[PDB]
């Protein structure tokens, strides 16, 4: 596998996050902040070219 569970309808994503809730409605969102990515930077560079 690679990227395959993200193909399960609505692939138009922005960022990934996983969360749960307690019993009293309080939740805990965890959003990992991505670093800059080399292949996407190269795709933007060759798009400029």
């Amino acid at each position: 596998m690679l990227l395959e569970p993200l193909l399960s309808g609505d692939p138009r994503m922005t960022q990934l996050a996983i969360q749960y809730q307690q019993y009293n409605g309080r939740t805990f969102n965890v959003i990992p902040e991505m670093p800059g990515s080399v292949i996407a930077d190269c795709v933007q560079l060759t798009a400029e070219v």
Binding site: E4, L7, S8, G9, D10, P11
Partner: protein, 140 residues
Amino acid sequence: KRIPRKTKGKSSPATAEPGTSNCEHYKARPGIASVQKATESAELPMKNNDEGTPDKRGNTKGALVNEHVEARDEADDATKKQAKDTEKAKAQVTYSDTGINNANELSRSGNVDNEGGSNQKPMSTRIAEATSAIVSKHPA
């Protein structure tokens, strides 16, 4: 040089040496082969869930079946695999028929597409039909 690939992609004086002497005299105390055979049981990665996913052409791959029925039969198949792996006639650790009522669970299947409709007709045939509806030919 010239490394192979797993998958196709695009192209279709005197040396007395009194130090060491390696013969015998220590046995493996939990057992080398047994502990490493457990390790290569545990080494294998997870098998993929390619159900309800687009293929190359765009059609959702997998069999046409209800989502909840596919989840329940998938728990059944896991119970039978657990029975064959513990080598009993019944898996003692069972995944199905538990005390938890789980009548709302859904595992992905080939019934539903990405937009949200059914797959009685695949997406390639649906697109080809919707564009073959409007054609025009030469006059006689």
